[PDB]
Structure formats: C-alpha cells, structure tokens
C-alpha cells in the first residue's frame, strides 16, 4: 500500500534554481527525462526498497553474442540496481556456454533456452537490453516507471526530419516527417511487466502485418518501438547517459556520466 519514508537529511530542492539548465529534463507530456543531477538516489532507493521492488533484466544472447555475457553480467553486478532484488533472464541458444558469474545477495539468474506470465509473478519491472554492452556507472531505480524508452545517442540533438523512422506508408512502423518526439534506441527499454508485454505484443503483431505485406521496417524492431512510443508516450525517457558509445561519440560535456555503453 506504501509506507512512510523515514526521516532523511538532504539538500533542500530550490524552486528558483533549475537542476540542469543545459538540457530538457521533462517531456511535454510531463514525463521526467533522466539525466545526472535530476534525481536524489537516496530518496528513490528508499521509495523502491519500501515496496520490496524486484527488477527483471532480460538479454538475448545467441551464437557469437554469448561471448559478451561475462562482461555484461559482471558489470551489471557492480552497477545495475545494486541493493535491490534482481532477476537476470538470459535467453540463449547455448545454455552451457553461459559463464558462471558470482552474484550479490538477493540476485538471481535464469537461463532459458531458445512463458510470459512467469514474469508477472516474478518481477515488478522488466528492463530489456542488448547484451553487447557493459555497465560503466550507476543504473538504478531512477529508471523505473510504467513505460520508458532511451534516447538513441546519435540522434538526441537531431531534428525529427533527420530521425531514421520508417518512412514508407506501407509499413505499420510508418512515421511521417512532421511527426515524432524523439528517436528511441531498441537496445534499452522497459517498464512494468504489463507495459512491456503490451509493447512487445504490439511490435510482434505489427511486424507480422508487415511480413504479410512484403515489407521489413528500415530498422526492424527499433522502427516499431519508435512507432509504439510515439502513440503511447513513455512515462520516463532516459538520456543517452544510459546508452552511449564513447568510441563513436566521445564524451560530450552534456553527459556527466556514461552508464551503459557499447563494448570496445
């Protein structure tokens, strides 16, 4: 039902001082855009611990991608939801090649060789990411919300006409040039179990419709993700801190932390 926070001592928020003056920190549908400086982690950890929050983390690692699991899981252990209950779900064609990674207390891993309600009974939130990445800094409960997408690192400063949406009206993923909020990357999204299952259900149906019609969206599931989040606005948006490639993009001033990154 949600118990009281304990007494806590922290700096007073200042109404007449913005957290960040260099970036947009709230969407026009009033969803926070999560940048370093916008959140007090101690406050958020308390709120989420008091609810006994469990976070599921899902990765698909097929064929050569199994090689990335060791670094992925080891760095998640250092940086992902530390202090909270975590259930890793590794979807893989090579169950025996999954590295044996030492987990912290309250954390567990299931290997599933390649049923949806499993998630509803096991976790509160689902975080769906690509495996060819490593955590380099804190990725915590600040991301948790009914539905979130992450700003693609190549497009956060782009105007919408430049976004690589599906542009053919024949595709279910079609977005015209005068539409679009952001360009979300397919490599990092999540939310409540119910919201994530709704999204992935919608994108599986749209992709079949397209297959039937002999069309494949320009950026595949990412194109459909972008269509879905246009029409169903995420309740938080994560800044590109949460999906970076320092080799391709460097380290701009506007990024105070590089949290989850492409592997060198």
Provide the annotated active-site residues.
222
d(CA 247, CA 261): 10
Output the smallest distance, CB 56 to Hg ion, in A: 8
Residue from 225, 229, 243, 258 touching Hg ion (CB under 5 A): that is 225
Segment lying near Hg ion (by CB under 5 A), choices 76-84, 174-182, 217-225, 242-250: 217-225
What phi and psi values does residue 220 have, to the nearest 5 degrees? 60, -125
Segment lying near Hg ion (by CB under 5 A), choices 24-32, 130-138, 140-148, 199-207: 199-207
DSSP tally for the chain: helices H, then strands E: 6, 10
Cβ nearer to Hg ion, comparing 45 with 171: 171
Determine if 203 is a binding residue for Hg ion (CB under 5 A): yes
Cβ nearer to Hg ion, comparing 116 with 161: 116
Q: Which of 188, 182, 255 is nearest to 27 (CA)?
A: 182
* 206 assigned ligand-binding residue: no
d(CA 221, CA 216): 10
Cβ nearer to Hg ion, comparing 35 with 228: 228
* 87 assigned ligand-binding residue: no
Structure tokens at 26: 């709230």
Output the smallest distance, CB 31 to Hg ion, in A: 18
d(CA 152, CA 242): 9
Residue from 45, 53, 58, 145 touching Hg ion (CB under 5 A): that is 58
Contact letters for Hg ion, residues 90-129 (x by CB under 5 A): ------------------------------------x-x-
Determine if 207 is a binding residue for Hg ion (CB under 5 A): yes
* 245 assigned ligand-binding residue: yes
Q: Which of 105, 239, 120, 243 is nearest to 187 (CA)?
A: 243
Cβ nearer to Hg ion, comparing 90 with 258: 90
Residues 22-51 that bind Hg ion (CB under 5 A): none
Determine if 150 is a binding residue for Hg ion (CB under 5 A): no
* 184 assigned ligand-binding residue: no
- Is residue 141 within 8 A of residue 53, CB to CB? The reply is yes
* 222 assigned ligand-binding residue: yes
216 Ramachandran zone, left/alpha/beta (phi>0; psi -120 to 50): beta
Residue ranges in the chain assigned as alpha helix (H): 41-50, 69-79, 117-122, 193-212, 221-231, 246-249
Strand order through the sheet with 188-192? 33-34, 236-238, 147-150, 188-192, 125-129, 54-61, 85-92, 107-113
Determine if 193 is a binding residue for Hg ion (CB under 5 A): no
* 261 assigned ligand-binding residue: no
Determine if 221 is a binding residue for Hg ion (CB under 5 A): yes
Numbered residues of the known binding site: 60-62, 65, 130-132, 152, 164, 222, 245
Which stretches of the chain bind Hg ion, using CB under 5 A?
58, 126, 128, 203-204, 207, 221, 224-225
């Amino acid at each position: 039902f949600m118990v009281s926070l304990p007494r806590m001592v922290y700096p007073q928020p200042k109404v007449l001082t913005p957290c960040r003056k260099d970036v947009l920190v709230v969407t026009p549908w009033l969803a926070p855009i999560v940048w370093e400086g916008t959140f007090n982690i101690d406050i958020l950890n308390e709120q989420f611990r008091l609810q006994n929050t469990t976070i599921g983390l899902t990765v698909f690692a097929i064929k050569k991608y199994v090689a990335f699991l060791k670094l992925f899981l080891e760095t998640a252990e250092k940086h992902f939801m530390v202090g909270h209950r975590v259930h890793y779900y590794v979807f893989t064609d090579q169950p025996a090649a999954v590295p044996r990674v030492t987990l912290g207390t309250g954390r567990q891993l299931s290997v599933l060789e390649v049923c949806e309600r499993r998630f509803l009974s096991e976790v509160d939130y689902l975080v769906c990411v690509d495996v060819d990445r490593e955590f380099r800094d804190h990725v915590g409960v600040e991301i948790l919300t009914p539905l979130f997408g992450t700003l693609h690192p190549s497009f956060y400063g782009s105007s919408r006409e430049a976004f690589t949406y599906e542009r053919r009206p024949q595709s279910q993923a079609y977005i015209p040039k005068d539409e679009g909020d952001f360009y979300y990357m397919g490599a990092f999204f999540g939310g409540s179990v119910q919201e994530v299952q709704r999204l992935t259900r919608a994108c599986h149906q749209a992709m079949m419709v397209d297959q039937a019609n002999g069309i494949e969206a320009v950026w595949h599931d990412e194109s459909h993700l972008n269509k879905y989040l246009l029409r169903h606005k995420p309740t938080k948006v994560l800044s590109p801190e949460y999906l970076w490639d320092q080799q391709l993009l460097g380290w701009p001033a506007v990024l105070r932390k590089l949290r989850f990154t492409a592997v060198p």
